[PDB]
Symmetry: C2
Subunit: 104 residues, 2 copies
Protein backbone atom coordinates (compact mmCIF):
# COMPACT_ATOMS: atom_id res chain seq x y z
CA UNK A 1 0.00 0.00 0.00
CA UNK A 2 0.92 3.64 -0.51
CA UNK A 3 -1.04 6.75 0.47
CA UNK A 4 -0.31 10.05 -1.28
CA UNK A 5 -1.62 13.53 -0.44
CA UNK A 6 -1.57 15.88 -3.44
CA UNK A 7 -2.03 19.60 -2.86
CA UNK A 8 -2.88 22.52 -5.13
CA UNK A 9 -4.46 25.96 -4.90
CA UNK A 10 -8.05 26.42 -6.05
CA UNK A 11 -8.80 29.18 -8.53
CA UNK A 12 -11.48 31.70 -7.46
CA UNK A 13 -15.02 30.32 -7.35
CA UNK A 14 -16.62 27.11 -6.12
CA UNK A 15 -15.40 24.33 -8.40
CA UNK A 16 -16.21 21.38 -6.15
CA UNK A 17 -19.09 20.01 -8.25
CA UNK A 18 -16.94 20.22 -11.39
CA UNK A 19 -13.86 18.60 -9.80
CA UNK A 20 -16.03 15.90 -8.21
CA UNK A 21 -17.52 15.16 -11.62
CA UNK A 22 -14.13 14.88 -13.33
CA UNK A 23 -13.01 12.28 -10.80
CA UNK A 24 -16.35 10.43 -10.62
CA UNK A 25 -16.36 9.97 -14.40
CA UNK A 26 -12.68 8.94 -14.41
CA UNK A 27 -13.34 6.44 -11.62
CA UNK A 28 -15.97 4.66 -13.74
CA UNK A 29 -13.26 3.84 -16.31
CA UNK A 30 -10.44 1.34 -16.07
CA UNK A 31 -8.10 4.19 -14.99
CA UNK A 32 -8.28 3.35 -11.26
CA UNK A 33 -7.68 -0.26 -12.29
CA UNK A 34 -4.57 0.65 -14.29
CA UNK A 35 -3.23 2.67 -11.36
CA UNK A 36 -4.27 0.23 -8.64
CA UNK A 37 -6.39 2.68 -6.65
CA UNK A 38 -7.97 1.28 -3.50
CA UNK A 39 -9.58 4.47 -2.19
CA UNK A 40 -9.71 8.13 -3.15
CA UNK A 41 -10.86 11.25 -1.31
CA UNK A 42 -10.94 14.89 -2.44
CA UNK A 43 -11.10 17.72 0.08
CA UNK A 44 -10.89 21.49 0.24
CA UNK A 45 -9.75 23.91 2.91
CA UNK A 46 -10.04 27.63 2.13
CA UNK A 47 -8.20 28.07 -1.21
CA UNK A 48 -6.49 24.63 -0.97
CA UNK A 49 -7.39 21.50 -2.93
CA UNK A 50 -6.45 18.04 -1.61
CA UNK A 51 -6.39 14.71 -3.43
CA UNK A 52 -5.82 11.81 -1.02
CA UNK A 53 -5.28 8.48 -2.81
CA UNK A 54 -4.33 4.98 -1.60
CA UNK A 55 -2.83 2.67 -4.22
CA UNK A 56 -1.78 -0.97 -4.13
CA UNK A 57 1.07 -2.41 -6.17
CA UNK A 58 -0.58 -5.85 -6.37
CA UNK A 59 -3.86 -4.71 -7.96
CA UNK A 60 -2.49 -4.03 -11.45
CA UNK A 61 0.40 -4.73 -13.78
CA UNK A 62 3.13 -2.11 -13.85
CA UNK A 63 3.24 0.10 -16.94
CA UNK A 64 6.15 2.48 -17.60
CA UNK A 65 4.78 4.50 -20.51
CA UNK A 66 6.75 7.09 -22.43
CA UNK A 67 3.68 9.36 -22.63
CA UNK A 68 0.68 10.07 -20.45
CA UNK A 69 -2.28 7.80 -20.98
CA UNK A 70 -5.05 9.81 -22.77
CA UNK A 71 -7.36 9.37 -19.77
CA UNK A 72 -4.76 10.83 -17.43
CA UNK A 73 -4.00 13.63 -19.88
CA UNK A 74 -7.73 14.42 -19.99
CA UNK A 75 -8.32 14.76 -16.24
CA UNK A 76 -4.95 16.46 -15.74
CA UNK A 77 -5.61 19.19 -18.30
CA UNK A 78 -9.26 19.50 -17.22
CA UNK A 79 -8.18 20.12 -13.63
CA UNK A 80 -6.04 23.03 -14.87
CA UNK A 81 -9.27 25.04 -15.17
CA UNK A 82 -9.90 24.81 -11.43
CA UNK A 83 -6.49 24.49 -9.73
CA UNK A 84 -2.98 25.94 -10.02
CA UNK A 85 0.23 24.83 -8.27
CA UNK A 86 0.38 26.15 -4.72
CA UNK A 87 4.00 26.92 -5.66
CA UNK A 88 6.09 17.77 -7.20
CA UNK A 89 2.65 18.47 -5.72
CA UNK A 90 2.69 15.67 -3.14
CA UNK A 91 3.08 16.35 0.55
CA UNK A 92 6.07 14.74 2.27
CA UNK A 93 5.15 12.35 5.10
CA UNK A 94 7.39 12.44 8.20
CA UNK A 95 5.29 10.55 10.81
CA UNK A 96 3.10 7.46 10.54
CA UNK A 97 1.38 5.61 13.40
CA UNK A 98 -1.01 2.73 12.90
CA UNK A 99 -3.14 0.75 15.34
CA UNK A 100 -1.54 -2.65 15.85
CA UNK A 101 1.84 -1.46 14.57
CA UNK A 102 2.77 1.63 16.55
CA UNK A 103 5.16 3.93 14.74
CA UNK A 104 5.71 2.80 11.16
Amino acid sequence: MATTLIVARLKPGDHRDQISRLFAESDTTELPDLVGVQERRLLTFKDLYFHLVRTDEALSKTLTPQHDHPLFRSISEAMDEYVTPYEQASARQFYHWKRGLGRV
Copy 2:
Protein backbone atom coordinates in the same frame (compact mmCIF):
# COMPACT_ATOMS: atom_id res chain seq x y z
CA UNK B 1 -13.88 8.97 9.74
CA UNK B 2 -10.90 10.69 8.11
CA UNK B 3 -9.92 14.20 9.18
CA UNK B 4 -7.29 16.47 7.64
CA UNK B 5 -6.09 19.46 9.70
CA UNK B 6 -4.13 22.23 7.97
CA UNK B 7 -1.80 24.82 9.46
CA UNK B 8 1.06 26.99 8.28
CA UNK B 9 4.57 26.04 9.34
CA UNK B 10 6.67 28.54 11.22
CA UNK B 11 10.16 29.06 9.74
CA UNK B 12 12.66 26.25 10.26
CA UNK B 13 12.56 22.44 10.26
CA UNK B 14 10.32 21.19 13.09
CA UNK B 15 9.77 17.60 11.91
CA UNK B 16 11.97 16.11 14.64
CA UNK B 17 10.20 18.04 17.40
CA UNK B 18 6.72 17.38 16.03
CA UNK B 19 7.53 13.68 15.69
CA UNK B 20 8.75 13.61 19.30
CA UNK B 21 5.48 15.19 20.48
CA UNK B 22 3.27 12.65 18.72
CA UNK B 23 5.61 9.75 19.56
CA UNK B 24 5.05 10.59 23.24
CA UNK B 25 1.34 11.19 22.69
CA UNK B 26 0.70 7.97 20.75
CA UNK B 27 2.20 5.89 23.60
CA UNK B 28 -0.51 7.21 25.95
CA UNK B 29 -4.12 6.08 26.06
CA UNK B 30 -5.03 9.01 23.77
CA UNK B 31 -5.44 6.99 20.52
CA UNK B 32 -7.59 4.51 22.46
CA UNK B 33 -9.82 7.33 23.72
CA UNK B 34 -10.24 8.99 20.32
CA UNK B 35 -10.41 5.66 18.50
CA UNK B 36 -7.50 6.46 16.20
CA UNK B 37 -6.77 3.77 13.63
CA UNK B 38 -4.00 5.64 11.79
CA UNK B 39 -2.21 9.00 11.94
CA UNK B 40 -0.03 10.65 9.29
CA UNK B 41 1.81 13.97 9.60
CA UNK B 42 3.05 15.64 6.42
CA UNK B 43 4.54 18.90 5.15
CA UNK B 44 4.39 20.69 1.80
CA UNK B 45 6.26 23.97 1.36
CA UNK B 46 5.09 26.10 4.32
CA UNK B 47 2.12 23.82 5.08
CA UNK B 48 1.53 21.31 7.86
CA UNK B 49 -1.02 18.51 7.57
CA UNK B 50 -2.29 16.20 10.31
CA UNK B 51 -4.25 13.30 8.80
CA UNK B 52 -6.13 11.02 11.21
CA UNK B 53 -8.45 8.06 10.62
CA UNK B 54 -10.68 7.14 13.56
CA UNK B 55 -11.13 19.66 27.48
CA UNK B 56 -9.06 16.52 28.03
CA UNK B 57 -5.46 16.96 29.24
CA UNK B 58 -4.03 14.52 26.68
CA UNK B 59 -5.64 16.44 23.81
CA UNK B 60 -4.74 19.88 25.17
CA UNK B 61 -1.08 19.00 25.72
CA UNK B 62 -0.50 18.38 22.02
CA UNK B 63 -2.38 21.57 21.10
CA UNK B 64 -0.18 23.57 23.47
CA UNK B 65 3.09 22.07 22.20
CA UNK B 66 2.27 22.64 18.52
CA UNK B 67 2.22 26.42 19.10
CA UNK B 68 6.02 26.54 18.83
CA UNK B 69 5.82 25.16 15.28
CA UNK B 70 2.59 26.22 13.50
CA UNK B 71 0.34 29.25 13.01
CA UNK B 72 -3.21 29.32 11.60
CA UNK B 73 -3.33 29.17 7.80
CA UNK B 74 -5.65 32.22 7.78
CA UNK B 75 -5.34 34.75 10.57
CA UNK B 76 -8.63 36.66 10.43
CA UNK B 77 -10.49 34.04 12.52
CA UNK B 78 -7.37 32.03 13.29
CA UNK B 79 -7.68 29.45 16.10
CA UNK B 80 -11.47 29.76 16.43
CA UNK B 81 -12.66 28.68 13.00
CA UNK B 82 -12.19 25.07 12.03
CA UNK B 83 -8.77 24.12 10.66
CA UNK B 84 -10.02 20.84 9.15
CA UNK B 85 -10.62 20.33 5.44
CA UNK B 86 -14.05 19.35 4.10
CA UNK B 87 -14.33 16.17 2.05
CA UNK B 88 -16.43 16.43 -1.11
CA UNK B 89 -15.56 13.17 -2.92
CA UNK B 90 -14.94 9.56 -1.84
CA UNK B 91 -14.51 6.46 -4.00
CA UNK B 92 -13.60 3.05 -2.61
CA UNK B 93 -12.77 -0.10 -4.53
CA UNK B 94 -15.50 -2.66 -3.93
CA UNK B 95 -18.31 -0.15 -3.41
CA UNK B 96 -17.34 2.41 -6.03
CA UNK B 97 -19.16 5.63 -5.13
CA UNK B 98 -19.16 6.67 -1.49
CA UNK B 99 -19.61 10.44 -1.84
CA UNK B 100 -21.65 11.47 -3.73
